[PDB]
Amino acid sequence: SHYKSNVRDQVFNLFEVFGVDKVLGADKFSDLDADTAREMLTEIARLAEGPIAESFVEGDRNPPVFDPETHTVTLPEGFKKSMRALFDGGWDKVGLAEHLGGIPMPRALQWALIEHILGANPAAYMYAMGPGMSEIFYNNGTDEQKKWATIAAERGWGATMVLTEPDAGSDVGAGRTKAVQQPDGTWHIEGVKRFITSADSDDLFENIMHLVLARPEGAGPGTKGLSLFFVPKFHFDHETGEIGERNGVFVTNVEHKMGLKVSATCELSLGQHGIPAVGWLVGEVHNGIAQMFDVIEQARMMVGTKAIATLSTGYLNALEYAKERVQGADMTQMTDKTAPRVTITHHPDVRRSLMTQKAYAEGLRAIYLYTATFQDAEVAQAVHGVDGDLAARVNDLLLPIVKGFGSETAYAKLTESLQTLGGSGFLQDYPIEQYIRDSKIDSLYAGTTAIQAQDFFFRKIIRDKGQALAYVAGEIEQFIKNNGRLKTERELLATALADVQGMAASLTGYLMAAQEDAASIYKVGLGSVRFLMAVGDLLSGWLLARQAAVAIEKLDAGATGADKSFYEGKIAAASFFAKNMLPLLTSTRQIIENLDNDVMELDEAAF
Amino acid sequence: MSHYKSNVRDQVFNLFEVFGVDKVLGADKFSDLDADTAREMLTEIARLAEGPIAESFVEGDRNPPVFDPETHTVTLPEGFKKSMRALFDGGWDKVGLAEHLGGIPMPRALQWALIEHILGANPAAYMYAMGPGMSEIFYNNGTDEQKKWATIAAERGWGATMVLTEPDAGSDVGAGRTKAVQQPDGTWHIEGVKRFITSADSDDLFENIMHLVLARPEGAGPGTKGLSLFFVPKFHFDHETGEIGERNGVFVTNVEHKMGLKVSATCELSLGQHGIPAVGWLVGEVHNGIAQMFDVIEQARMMVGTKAIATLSTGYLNALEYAKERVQGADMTQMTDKTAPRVTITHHPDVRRSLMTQKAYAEGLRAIYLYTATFQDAEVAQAVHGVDGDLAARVNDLLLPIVKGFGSETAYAKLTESLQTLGGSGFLQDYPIEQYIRDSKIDSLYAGTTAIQAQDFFFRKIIRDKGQALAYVAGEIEQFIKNGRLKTERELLATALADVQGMAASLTGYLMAAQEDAASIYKVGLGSVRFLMAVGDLLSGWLLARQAAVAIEKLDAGATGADKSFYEGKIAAASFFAKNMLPLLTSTRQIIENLDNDVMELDEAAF
Numbered sequence A: 001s002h003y004k005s006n007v008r009d010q011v012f013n014l015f016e017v018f019g020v021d022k023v024l025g026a027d028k029f030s031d032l033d034a035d036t037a038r039e040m041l042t043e044i045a046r047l048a049e050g051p052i053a054e055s056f057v058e059g060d061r062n063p064p065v066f067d068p069e070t071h072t073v074t075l076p077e078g079f080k081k082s083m084r085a086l087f088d089g090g091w092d093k094v095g096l097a098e099h100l101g102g103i104p105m106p107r108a109l110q111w112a113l114i115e116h117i118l119g120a121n122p123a124a125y126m127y128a129m130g131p132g133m134s135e136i137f138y139n140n141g142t143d144e145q146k147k148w149a150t151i152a153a154e155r156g157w158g159a160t161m162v163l164t165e166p167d168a169g170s171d172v173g174a175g176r177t178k179a180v181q182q183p184d185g186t187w188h189i190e191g192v193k194r195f196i197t198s199a200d201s202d203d204l205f206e207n208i209m210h211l212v213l214a215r216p217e218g219a220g221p222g223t224k225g226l227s228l229f230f231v232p233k234f235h236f237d238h239e240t241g242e243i244g245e246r247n248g249v250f251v252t253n254v255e256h257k258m259g260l261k262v263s264a265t266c267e268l269s270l271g272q273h274g275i276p277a278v279g280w281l282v283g284e285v286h287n288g289i290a291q292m293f294d295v296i297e298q299a300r301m302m303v304g305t306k307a308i309a310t311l312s313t314g315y316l317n318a319l320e321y322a323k324e325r326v327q328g329a330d331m332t333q334m335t336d337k338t339a340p341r342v343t344i345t346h347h348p349d350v351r352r353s354l355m356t357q358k359a360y361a362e363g364l365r366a367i368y369l370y371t372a373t374f375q376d377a378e379v380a381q382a383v384h385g386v387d388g389d390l391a392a393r394v395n396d397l398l399l400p401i402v403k404g405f406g407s408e409t410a411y412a413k414l415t416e417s418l419q420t421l422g423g424s425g426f427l428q429d430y431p432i433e434q435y436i437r438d439s440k441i442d443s444l445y446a447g448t449t450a451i452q453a454q455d456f457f458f459r460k461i462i463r464d465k466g467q468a469l470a471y472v473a474g475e476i477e478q479f480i481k482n483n484g485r486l487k488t489e490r491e492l493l494a495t496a497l498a499d500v501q502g503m504a505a506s507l508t509g510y511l512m513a514a515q516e517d518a519a520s521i522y523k524v525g526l527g528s529v530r531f532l533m534a535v536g537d538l539l540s541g542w543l544l545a546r547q548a549a550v551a552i553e554k555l556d557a558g559a560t561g562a563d564k565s566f567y568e569g570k571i572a573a574a575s576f577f578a579k580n581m582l583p584l585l586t587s588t589r590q591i592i593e594n595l596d597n598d599v600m601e602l603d604e605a606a607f
Numbered sequence B: 001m002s003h004y005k006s007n008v009r010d011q012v013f014n015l016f017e018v019f020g021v022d023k024v025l026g027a028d029k030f031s032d033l034d035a036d037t038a039r040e041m042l043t044e045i046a047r048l049a050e051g052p053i054a055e056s057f058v059e060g061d062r063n064p065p066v067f068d069p070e071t072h073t074v075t076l077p078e079g080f081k082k083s084m085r086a087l088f089d090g091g092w093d094k095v096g097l098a099e100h101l102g103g104i105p106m107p108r109a110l111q112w113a114l115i116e117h118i119l120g121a122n123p124a125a126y127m128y129a130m131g132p133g134m135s136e137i138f139y140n141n142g143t144d145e146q147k148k149w150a151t152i153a154a155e156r157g158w159g160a161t162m163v164l165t166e167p168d169a170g171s172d173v174g175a176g177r178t179k180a181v182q183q184p185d186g187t188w189h190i191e192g193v194k195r196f197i198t199s200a201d202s203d204d205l206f207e208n209i210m211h212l213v214l215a216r217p218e219g220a221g222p223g224t225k226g227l228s229l230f231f232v233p234k235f236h237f238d239h240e241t242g243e244i245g246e247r248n249g250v251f252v253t254n255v256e257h258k259m260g261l262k263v264s265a266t267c268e269l270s271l272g273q274h275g276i277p278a279v280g281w282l283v284g285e286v287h288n289g290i291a292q293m294f295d296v297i298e299q300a301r302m303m304v305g306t307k308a309i310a311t312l313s314t315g316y317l318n319a320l321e322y323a324k325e326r327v328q329g330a331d332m333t334q335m336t337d338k339t340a341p342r343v344t345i346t347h348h349p350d351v352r353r354s355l356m357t358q359k360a361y362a363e364g365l366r367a368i369y370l371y372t373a374t375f376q377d378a379e380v381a382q383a384v385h386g387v388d389g390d391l392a393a394r395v396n397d398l399l400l401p402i403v404k405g406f407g408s409e410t411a412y413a414k415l416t417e418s419l420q421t422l423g424g425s426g427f428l429q430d431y432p433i434e435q436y437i438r439d440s441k442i443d444s445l446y447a448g449t450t451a452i453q454a455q456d457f458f459f460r461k462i463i464r465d466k467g468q469a470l471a472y473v474a475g476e477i478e479q480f481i482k483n484g485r486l487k488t489e490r491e492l493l494a495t496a497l498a499d500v501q502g503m504a505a506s507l508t509g510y511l512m513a514a515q516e517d518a519a520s521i522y523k524v525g526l527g528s529v530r531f532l533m534a535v536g537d538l539l540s541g542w543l544l545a546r547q548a549a550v551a552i553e554k555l556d557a558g559a560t561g562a563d564k565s566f567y568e569g570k571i572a573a574a575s576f577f578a579k580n581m582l583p584l585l586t587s588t589r590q591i592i593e594n595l596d597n598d599v600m601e602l603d604e605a606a607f
């Protein structure tokens, strides 16, 4: 019971703030109503708090063991029992397309449900992403491959995404794994891939679908020359699904990691043990990097949501501790050393810390759910009035923030959660130090923060001609320009919005200067990550303020009890964030406006 | 070689070329320790740290200490005990020990530089070795009879602990309930349970351990002022010859499972609970416990800060080495060209930004701890600063919560940039950075949490000091500012100084206003930690600018080769720090100037 959920805040976002319930019971969501949506959330949260979180500690303390002769890993029993609970509930098929056995839902609800698993035992969701991959394979496959995809979903096959080599991590286009075409149309895959999550998974599944990037013999260089291949761990009867002889793809190593230990991260050898790794060209077209980005987009969304889920339970653990921990006198009585001892929530620094954890946790939850409301054309239309093309671009804009800003913030603020526990925070008896360790990776896999910030600026703004960015900017301007109990917050958001506008203009300026002085492009890189974090801070403060506006209406209408307390908390968090976090963007804008290339010209030997 | 990467060059630069500690070497107390010998000592202990000490860094974490309930002892991994012996066989546990106890006299600035190397390589190894230094503190505070015991303890190399914390008394030391009962023969029986005691047992490293234990005599008043300090040895011993005798009634009952620093056994210590009394001797035969124990706390706080700084340094240098060799991607000037030559990642602006962020904070932090150390000796303070003994003590006291709190928080925060530089490989235990991060998370907790550091800095080291020490340091900064390649840095430092002045005035106002409005004091708590961090950033920027000013002189004087590269890097770091770190203090002042008590008035249930 390390895991502390927050269904109340999820439902508040989904229904009171974004109005996702407007599509429930109609059109694609004809057979799922708002009441059923709430029950699913409570139901998955109960499961996550119980059987899923049961093995969170066991997975870390008793991690998988590799047998190098069998090329298999053994997972701890308790974690396998949590996996079966997940499957027994159909939760690995939430959001899956109906024709694959799934229950149709808005993506905003899907990610709200997944948050609970990510918070309770994130590696369990990763192992359980096979059906989601089946659906992507289906959408990209031939009619015949669609039959395989349908079999794989029904049988709950696991799956991996196989890009990375020792020399090709961020630079995916540098991969050397080759594909050799056979007369009958299959391919033989030959190479060694690195850091593959779930490349083996004990006996959780009867098969694993490896989606592998490889370069066909004679194809061009870079990512443009790569193709994507279905490489099953086991050959199988293409009609019935029956498992056949082992295919030539074997795990040859399993890493020892800082955290996320129960997730087997593996070296994957294809065609190196005298058995060919047969692969099938996905969709029988050569378009690998584009096809795989369907998968990368899901991964990046999941990692951000993972980081955010972990910070939320980190905060709630710190809050529960602080409420019961007696230490010291009220500061108003610090001189009187017979004064009553007080619980530490009375101390200002603890309150500063708890409100920092809360505002960022709840602001990040708003960000990923907001992002998810642009992931269905029909929800984007109903809740935002935006057509499908703009909705896809806005979602593409927000993904590197969910991932990049979410991962970095969660990890940083978990520092505060741990500090709230004092020395006990450093003990394994409490979950926070594992939160920190499990979440450090989120800034690295699915593309590093620097790669996130590069994607945001060059592809999601510049190549987009700023359309999505402009749309979101306009929604922030509209909120600022609309009671008067939010006057200070709106003034602080106006400055923050102008600051982010300034950063954007400055970075664009550097880019166009690179028409004349190539070296000027470096300034964009120097400021890329700070720009991303600034936008994320802006979105958090804006969405918190929106939440405060709804909380004010509900308090004015007569909210009582725990509702009153909740809405009061939203008002305090939006105000705190605007006064304590947003002003720093002014300084960041001025730093970005004065970047120079001194640090680039410096001799490497001077570091 | 090892995980540990030393920087003797930066240390010697700080001691000799910047602070001029050598001006006192070779004369008076340091009569028989010349500059050449000091350099040789730094080189020698650095090699010990890089070899035998660092050799068991990983082992101590992967094969951690075990508690044996059969004997109430702790057993340590063999590889670590061997490192400890390398340290004793060289005499490095007598680093800055008084001469009459067998030490070599040396300036504290040199002592802490020597210790930095052990703290970088295997910090627990130094903590276990703090016994001789505790003997010296027992000597200074003890009776004439006890001076003989402490001398015996130093000569035999007995271990030592500082025993304050209880389950209900951590930050609030004064709330401890452990109890001292005076006996007819003038000894005391100590009765109680102390928690989280570092080195409470240590296998067979030593023939005795001296527990220095705070306890409340029956009948004494409340709080810390009612506490006395007691010498409680693990074994009774002959007070004249030192022969080890009967076991004393102080036993370890438990060893904590921690995020990091695993090889440092952290134990529940029970006194008088296992059927034989814990006999203790009133230190100095006076009742002055919390003042006496603070002689020890001061050393512990300096050690933790230096430790955090030591760990950030070797973290940075591991990251830098990795970046120099890792090929990934094309140069940003050739982004579009997917045929462009691949480059090492030091060519990437974000990596260069990350490295210079690590460099400037690591080297800035080293300057701070060594600058602080030049005020710990009256002779050094006079010779290098021209300040007398009283002002030197107040300045040192002002700077300790900076070394500890700002050093603690900064090291852990920037190791994130170190780990990010390795990409996905930073998450592997194969590289030392994830352990650096785990080992240093505690630095913000033990020896007083960051919040306690901040309260001490403001309430005791500034307000009670009536700002004398603070005004002296501010005067040194202003002097450097008033004095042309360093014009911009001076202008940015001038802004930063004004910013910190503002924060000081605003928090003092909040405090003084509390006489008419009690709740006003909360705004001091709300801002105290941010104020501490700002002063830390200001000192880093100032000292780095001082270093660049010396580097300019040396380059103008004709430096070449490796020296030139080093001096160039000092110029780049100072400028980068001034332009990228210091401006954020402007926004922090404005946030501090607008603090309110909304977060204090909010109902706990709205969190």
Ligand SMILES: CCCCCCCCCCCCCC(=O)SCCNC(=O)CCNC(=O)[C@H](O)C(C)(C)COP(=O)(O)OP(=O)(O)OC[C@H]1O[C@@H](n2cnc3c(N)ncnc32)[C@H](O)[C@@H]1OP(=O)(O)O
Pocket (backbone or CB within 6 Å): A126, A127, A129, A130, A132, A133, A136, A159, A160, A161, A163, A164, A169, A170, A171, A172, A173, A197, A198, A222, A223, A224, A289, A290, A293, A294, A295, A296, A297, A298, A299, A303, A445, A446, A447, A448, A451, A455, A459, B338
């Ligand atoms: C849901 C199913 C999951 C099944 C099992 C998995 C469960 C386990 C979860 C494990 C979690 C994390 C695992 C991982 O880390 S997998 C490996 C992740 N690697 C990366 O993220 C790569 C990081 N590096 C980059 O992103 C680089 O910037 C890169 C894009 C590789 C640079 O290559 P490039 O210079 O060649 O790219 P370029 O800009 O020119 O575009 C080339 C084509 O790539 C497509 N593309 C690029 N960027 C995007 C984005 N953001 N979104 C969609 N598509 C993108 C485009 O096709 C582009 O072509 P065009 O420019 O002509 O359109």
Ligand SMILES: CCCCCCCCCCCCCC(=O)SCCNC(=O)CCNC(=O)[C@H](O)C(C)(C)COP(=O)(O)OP(=O)(O)OC[C@H]1O[C@@H](n2cnc3c(N)ncnc32)[C@H](O)[C@@H]1OP(=O)(O)O
Pocket (backbone or CB within 6 Å): A337, B127, B130, B131, B133, B134, B137, B160, B161, B162, B164, B165, B170, B171, B172, B173, B174, B198, B199, B223, B224, B225, B290, B291, B294, B296, B297, B299, B300, B446, B447, B448, B449, B452, B456, B460
């Ligand atoms: C070198 C030998 C080491 C051998 C041991 C080997 C192992 C070491 C390695 C282990 C590393 C971890 C070590 C630990 O964690 S030990 C536990 C550390 N605990 C703390 O640091 C306490 C944190 N909390 C505080 O500091 C509180 O602020 C405290 C002061 C305790 C609050 O109590 P209070 O309200 O009663 O304090 P007050 O402000 O009124 O002052 C009371 C008296 O305390 C003395 N004092 C207080 N502060 C200082 C400082 N900075 N410096 C010196 N003395 C201080 C004063 O005597 C004061 O009396 P006066 O006000 O009349 O002067």
Ligand SMILES: Cc1cc2nc3c(=O)[nH]c(=O)nc-3n(C[C@H](O)[C@H](O)[C@H](O)COP(=O)(O)OP(=O)(O)OC[C@H]3O[C@@H](n4cnc5c(N)ncnc54)[C@H](O)[C@@H]3O)c2cc1C
Pocket (backbone or CB within 6 Å): A160, A161, A162, A163, A164, A166, A168, A169, A170, A171, A194, A195, A196, A197, A198, A257, A260, A265, A441, A444, A445, A446, A447, A448, A449, A450, A451, B326, B327, B328, B329, B330, B345, B348, B349, B350, B351, B420, B421, B422, B423, B424, B425, B427
């Ligand atoms: C636990 C774990 C699981 C993983 N699972 C999978 C998986 O299942 N499938 C898979 O395909 N991959 C997987 N990965 C790979 C992961 O996506 C890569 O580690 C990641 O993209 C970073 O690449 P790298 O490790 O080679 O680091 P590098 O690319 O070498 O990064 C080194 C440093 O240089 C920086 N850098 C590199 N190129 C640039 C550039 N052009 N501009 C600016 N900075 C740059 C990086 O930001 C980083 O700081 C996993 C990684 C981990 C840690």
Ligand SMILES: Cc1cc2nc3c(=O)[nH]c(=O)nc-3n(C[C@H](O)[C@H](O)[C@H](O)COP(=O)(O)OP(=O)(O)OC[C@H]3O[C@@H](n4cnc5c(N)ncnc54)[C@H](O)[C@@H]3O)c2cc1C
Pocket (backbone or CB within 6 Å): A325, A327, A328, A329, A344, A347, A348, A349, A350, A419, A420, A421, A422, A423, A424, A426, B161, B162, B163, B164, B165, B169, B170, B171, B172, B195, B196, B197, B198, B199, B258, B261, B266, B442, B445, B446, B447, B448, B449, B450, B451, B452
């Ligand atoms: C690895 C380790 C080794 C240790 N070794 C030793 C040892 O050898 N000897 C020893 O005596 N102790 C030792 N300690 C004890 C350590 O010093 C305490 O854990 C520390 O002082 C914090 O106390 P606590 O754990 O009770 O936290 P708490 O005092 O309960 O604090 C919890 C939270 O409340 C905050 N807080 C508490 N009081 C106040 C206040 N008045 N105002 C504002 N915020 C407040 C803290 O900052 C923290 O965020 C060790 C601790 C650890 C983790």
